[PDB]
């Protein structure tokens, strides 16, 4: 029961715990799809090529 309070808090946010981890686990794996497209203009590829065309 003493640790059930922890379950009443840690397991209360257990879905909140894991979901935030996977909402933070995608900040880098998505960076190779979501974060490369910002890089795709920040790598000067389109910045020079909007001017290149």
């Amino acid at each position: 029961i003493i640790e059930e309070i922890e379950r009443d808090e840690a397991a209360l946010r257990e879905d909140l715990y894991s979901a935030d981890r996977k909402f933070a686990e995608y900040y880098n794996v998505l960076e190779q799809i979501l974060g490369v497209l910002i890089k795709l203009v920040k790598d000067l590829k389109l910045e020079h090529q909007h001017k290149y065309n």
Binding site: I1, I2, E4, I5, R7, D8, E9, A11, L12, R13, E14, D15, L16
Partner: protein, 49 residues
């Protein structure tokens, strides 16, 4: 012949280690907190959020 056999062996068996933090009344401290909220505190939000 009855101090260790009866009153020590019945009053203190639920007084030594077990009921220190969940039986603070006759039998109800678990009912309203442990059974009451400590069973339900997670249930309060862990579906809404």
């Amino acid at each position: 012949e009855s101090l260790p056999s009866n009153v020590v062996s019945s009053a203190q068996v639920l007084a030594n280690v077990a009921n220190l933090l969940n039986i603070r009344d006759t039998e109800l401290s678990s009912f309203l907190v442990a059974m009451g909220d400590i069973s339900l505190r997670k249930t309060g939000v862990e579906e809404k959020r």
